Each structure stands twice: as structure tokens, then as C-alpha cells.
């Protein structure tokens with residue numbers, strides 16, 4: 425449905441929809457921009473990420489409320505409506521995974537872009553894993569694992585330890601370990617190594633870079649405090 | 653699309669969607685419940701009101717952001733996207749007005765229901781008036797006026813001055829006068845008379861009724877403070 429709108433108009437309207445807190449419209453404008461087939465700039469990558477994080481964040485928070493109600497219940501209404509929200513959540517994750525696979529990841533040759541999109545692929549399989557059950561759940565967990573691992577390998581080879589994309593990848597992969605993979609020690613180890621390596625690289629940064637890096641380091645510290 | 657769901661299941665799912673902060677789903681479930689054709693209980697009236705107030709509240713807040721950006725601008729994108737949001741806002745107001753007219757108002761014989769639905773009819777024409785221009789704007793303002801006035805006449809004949817529905821009607825009609833009709837003195841007069849008449853009736857109330865009434869009296873006082 426965004427096929428008739430210019431790419432630059434879609435980007436401009438995504439920024440307006442962000443100002444208006446209309447994140448479903450923001451996601452649909454960024455989906456249309458990706459579908460134009462050109463690579464995304466750094467600014468455009470971040471618009472894409474912000475739009476879908478907020479859309480899925482609404483759905484995950486709802487699914488959590490409904491799942492809690494359902495667990496306490498244990499008529500069909502609670503389960504039906506939890507299933508409705510779950511399906512729409514899965515559809516959002518599938519849409520994002522579809523954009524990554526057609527064809528954002530394959531055309532991303534620079535480290536900053538390739539790590540960004542692989543971390544997104546890990547995050548959206550992780551959201552699928554949160555609602556999954558059984559050994560359907562297993563292949564989804566492994567897919568999230570694989571994406572984060574490929575991003576980590578690239579990030580370690582190609583980015584400094586203070587790069588905010590590298591930091592946020594490590595933060596989300598530590599949450600995957602803690603929340604999804606039942607590997608709290610791996611979680612803690614990753615978050616502590618990441619924090620310590622970044623601290624030792626801070627001296628290299630300008631004032632503005634320092635503020636960007638240390639903000640994500642504080643998120644790593646807040647988790648280690650929650651986890652230990 | 654809610655035609656196949658039982659009325660009681662629609663009400664139960666509206667309450668769940670409220671807990672999950674999913675107000676578009678809440679509105680669609682309550683729309684489906686009204687469309688069953690039976691009168692609404694007091695609790696159900698309030699579910700209907702909460703669902704649509706939140707949906708339209710999102711849209712009005714967005715429209716305000718975009719209108720402000722557009723005014724400062726004065727390409728087509730800002731205007732196009734403001735128009736997109738405006739159209740969806742108008743469609744929500746038309747849907748609510750449609751439910752009131754088919755056939756909630758005509759079947760509402762008790763004062764508490766009839767005043768509730770007429771105040772809703774005033775509020776949703778008032779939201780239409782906020783985005784309207786010219787002398788299209790005039791007939792819409794007059795429609796909001798007419799609905800509030802009919803509700804006020806009934807409320808004064810049939811409800812005590814502390815009844816919370818009567819208070820909230822007077823509060824919203826005073827906002828209509830101040831914001832839409834360019835009649836700040838009428839606004840102030842209404843809000844002060846309403847506050848004073850309720851204060852003199854408080855002695856008749858139980859503890860719980862007193863808390864309900866005085867909460868809306870504080871909203872009247874907060875406006876008089878803003879307006880004087």
C-alpha cells in the first residue's frame with residue numbers, strides 16, 4: 425500500500441509519525457521505505473528499529489497481561505483473546521523478519537549495518553520465542569541464538585568495544601541468555617565482560633561518544649544488579 | 653465482524669482489552685456489543701465511553717502535534733499526513749455518532765442513560781468541531797450545542813446536582829463553551845454555578861458518593877483556575 429509514495433516522503437512521514445507517537449503508522453511508512461529496495465542509511469535504520477520496537481512492545485505488554493490472567497484462570501474468552509494478541513504479535517515479528525530476509529541482510533556489507541540487522545533478526549526471533557511452546561520453541565530459540573552469535577562475531581572483529589551498536593547487541597544477547605535460554609551464568613558473564621571491555625576503551629572517546637556508550641553501559645550494570 | 657461473538661463474550665473481552673491497554677480492540681468489542689441491539693447497562697455504558705475516549709484521545713493528540721508542525725511550515729507531506737490522521741479521527745467520531753443514533757439514544761428512557769448518551773453525542777460532535785473549518789464548522793458546533801443542551805435540560809430536571817454524570821456533562825459543556833464556541837464567560841458561569849450547586853448538596857451523600865462527586869468538582873475548579 426506504500427508503493428505509490430516516494431521514498432523520501434515515506435521517511436519524512438515516518439519522522440512525523442514518531443513525533444505524533446503513531447508507531448503503527450511509523451512502521452508502515454518504514455516498511456514501505458525498505459520495500460523500495462535501496463539500502464537504508466544509519467538514520468533510516470534507527471527509524472525502522474524504533475517503529476517496530478514500539479509496535480511490538482505494545483503487543484508484548486498486552487500479551488503479558490492476558491497470559492497472567494489466563495494462568496490464574498487455570499469460558500474460552502481469555503484464551504481466545506490472548507491467542508488473538510499472540511497472532512498479531514507473531515505477524516509483526518514475521519513482517520520484520522521478512523524485511524531482514526528480503527533483502528536487508530544480504531545487501532548489508534558494512535559492519536555497522538550488518539550487525540544492526542542481525543541483532544534485529546535475533547530480537548524478533550526472541551519475541552517469537554517468548555510466546556512459543558514445545559520443540560517449535562526450540563528451533564525458534566536456535567534461530568535467535570544464531571543471529572545474535574553471527575552479529576557478535578562480526579562486532580568483535582570490526583567494532584570497538586564501546587560502539588553503541590556492539591554494546592546494545594551484547595545487552596540483548598545477555599537478556600536472551602537470561603530470559604529465553606535459561607543460561608543466567610552465560611548472561612552474567614557476557615554482560616560483565618562487555619561492561620569491563622567498554623570501560624577500558626572509554627578514554628578514547630569524545631564527550632558525546634562517551635555519553636552514548638556510558639548510557640548503554642548503565643543498562644548492562646542495571647541488569648547485573650537485577651541478576652546478581 | 654463481531655456478529656458471530658456472544659454479547660457476554662464481547663463484554664468480557666472489552667474488560668480484558670481495557671486491562672491490556674488495547675483500546676482499539678476494546679472499542680471494537682463494545683461496538684459489537686451495542687450492535688446486538690439490546691440496551692446497555694451502566695457498567696457497559698462506561699466501557700463504551702472509556703474505549704472510544706482513549707481511541708479518539710490518541711488521534712486528537714496526534715492531530716495536535718501534526719497541526720502545530722503544519723502551522724509552523726506556513727512539500728505536501730505534513731498536510732497529507734495531518735489529513736490522514738484527521739480522516740481517521742472523523743471516522744471514529746462518525747462511528748460513535750452512528751451507534752448513538754442507531755439506536756442507543758432513541759431507546760434510552762431513563763435519565764441516567766439518556767443524559768449519558770446525549771453528553772457523548774455532544775463530545776463527539778465537539779471533536780469533529782475541533783478539526784472542522786468554515787461554515788461546515790458552524791452546523792457541527794450547533795449539533796454539539798444541541799446535544800449538550802438537551803442533556804443539561806434533562807439532568808437539571810431529573811438528577812441531583814451532585815450526580816457525577818450531571819457534573820461531567822456540565823464540565824464538558826463548559827469546555828465546549830470555552831474551546832469551541834468562543835464563549836469564555838458562559839464557560840466560567842456554567843462551571844461556577846455547577847460547582848456551587850454541587851457543594852451545597854454534598855451533605856446528602858455517603859462517603860463513597862462524596863468521593864465520586866468531589867473528584868469531578870475538582871476538575872471544575874481546575875478549569876476555573878485555568879480560565880480566571
Ligand SMILES: O=C(COc1ccccc1P(=O)(O)O)NC1CCCCC1
Nearest residue numbers: 480481482484485488547595596599643
Ligand atoms: O522491560 C523490558 C526490558 O527489556 C529489555 C531490556 C534490555 C534489553 C532488551 C530488552 P527487550 O526485551 O524489550 O528487547 N522490556 C519490556 C518488555 C514488555 C514490552 C515492553 C518492553
Ligand SMILES: O=C(COc1ccccc1P(=O)(O)O)NC1CCCCC1
Nearest residue numbers: 708709710712713716775823824827871
Ligand atoms: O487535556 C485535555 C483536557 O480535556 C478535557 C478537560 C475536561 C473535560 C473534557 C475534556 P476533553 O476535551 O478531553 O473531552 N484533553 C486532551 C486533549 C488531547 C487528547 C487527549 C485529551
Ligand SMILES: [Cl-]
Nearest residue numbers: 504505508665
Ligand atoms: Cl478474541
Ligand SMILES: [Cl-]
Nearest residue numbers: 530531532533
Ligand atoms: Cl553484501
Ligand SMILES: [Cl-]
Nearest residue numbers: 437732733736
Ligand atoms: Cl499520509
Ligand SMILES: [Cl-]
Nearest residue numbers: 758759760761
Ligand atoms: Cl424511550
Ligand SMILES: [Mg+2]
Nearest residue numbers: 429430431432
Ligand atoms: Mg522515486
Ligand SMILES: [Mg+2]
Nearest residue numbers: 463531532533
Ligand atoms: Mg551493500
Ligand SMILES: [Mg+2]
Nearest residue numbers: 657658659660
Ligand atoms: Mg446470544
Ligand SMILES: [Mg+2]
Nearest residue numbers: 691759760761
Ligand atoms: Mg428503554
